[PDB]
Amino acid sequence: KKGEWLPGLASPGYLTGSLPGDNGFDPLGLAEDPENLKWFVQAELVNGRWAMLGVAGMLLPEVFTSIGIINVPKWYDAGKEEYFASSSTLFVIEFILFHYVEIRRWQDIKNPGSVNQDPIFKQYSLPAGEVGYPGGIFNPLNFAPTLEAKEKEIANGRLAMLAFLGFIIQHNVTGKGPFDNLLQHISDPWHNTIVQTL
Amino acid sequence: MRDLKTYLSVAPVASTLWFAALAGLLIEINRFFPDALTFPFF
C-alpha cells in the first residue's frame, strides 16, 4: 500500500506510486495529464524548498533574539531597517542573479543534461542525475539521494509551505511575531485561540 | 421515488431551486453588508 490520504477513497489511475510522496491525493483533477504532472512535481519541490528556507529563517531568529543572544528585528519589519545599501540596489542585484539561475533551471527542465557543463571552463561538468535532483557539486557531502530521503524532503517541504501560510495569516490578523503568538497561546490556552482573536 | 429524484432534476425545477438558493445568499449578504460601493478591505 503506497499510502492513502483517505483510507476509504480509491486511487486515481494517473498516480502510480512512482514519485516520492505519492499518497494518492488530487481530487480536483489537476494532473490527469502526464505533461501537467511533470511540470507540477517540479513546482512542488521548488516551492517547498523556498518555503523551508523562508520559514526557518523567519522563526529561528525570533527565539534566538527572544532568549537574549542577538538582537534581530521581526521578519515583517526587517525590510525597513537601513542596511549598507539601498533596498533598490539589493533588489536589482537579486533580479539579475535570479534571472541567470532560473533560466538555467528552465533549460534543464526542458531538456535534461543540456545545461550541465560549465560555460566558462570547458571541463567541470555535472554527472547525469535527474530533474528536480541535481547532485554533483550541488551535493558536496555526497549523501545518498535515496528513495527514503526524497519522501523526507517533500514532507518537510509541504509542512514548511503550511508554516508559511500560517505565519502570514497570523501576522495579518493578530499583529505580532509567531513566537509571541505561540507562547501567549501556550501558557493560558483555553482562552487563547483564533476565536478570541476574531 | 427514483422517478421523483429524476423529475426534481428536470430543467425548470433545477433552475428554480438554484436561483432561490442564490437569491437567499445574496439577500443575506446585503442584509449584513449594506450599501456597498467599494471593496473596503484591501
Binding site: 539601498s86 533596498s87 533598490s88 533549460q107 545545461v115 | -
Partner: protein, 193 residues
Amino acid sequence: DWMPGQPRPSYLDGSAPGDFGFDPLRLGEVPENLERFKESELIHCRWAMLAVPGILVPEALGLGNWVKAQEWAALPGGQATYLGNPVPWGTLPTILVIEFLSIAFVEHQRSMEKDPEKKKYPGGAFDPLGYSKDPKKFHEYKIKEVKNGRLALLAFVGICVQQSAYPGTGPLENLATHLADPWHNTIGNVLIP
C-alpha cells in the same frame, strides 16, 4: 549558441559571421528577407561603432555632452563651434542642405549595387591596406567586426536610455555619478523611484 540547450533555427546553421542561432521571431524565415537583414545589420552596427566615440571623446575633452553640443540649432542666432572655434558656415540651413546633398548622393550610390555580397563587403577602394588577402583571417575579421558592432549598438541604446533618465547629462557624468557612490547610485533609483 545564444542559449545553450535551445534548438537552433533550421535556416540558421552557424556559418554566417555572427550566427549564434538567435531569431525567436522567425523574421528571417524568408531568405530574401534575411539577405537584406544582414546588410541592414552591418549598416546599423557600423554607424553605431562610429558614433559612440563621437559621443564619448569630446565630453571626455573640455566640451559639452552629445545633447548639449546640438542645442544652438533651436535658437535663431545659432552658430556652431568645433574645438572651441566659431564655425564659419555654422548656421543651420546651410548645414541641413549640405548634409542632405552629400548623404543622398552616397546613399543612393550604395543602393545602386546588386552583387549581393558587395552590398555588405564591397572592398576595393574601401580596403586600402588589403586585409582581404586570405579567406580564413578574412572570416575571422568579419566575426570580430560584427561582434564589436553588436556591442556598440548595445552601448548606444544604453546612452539614449540613460539620457532620458537623467536629462541634461553625459555618459561620463553618469560613470562619475556611479563611481561616487556605487552601492547607492544605480538603476534601482530609476526603476523604483
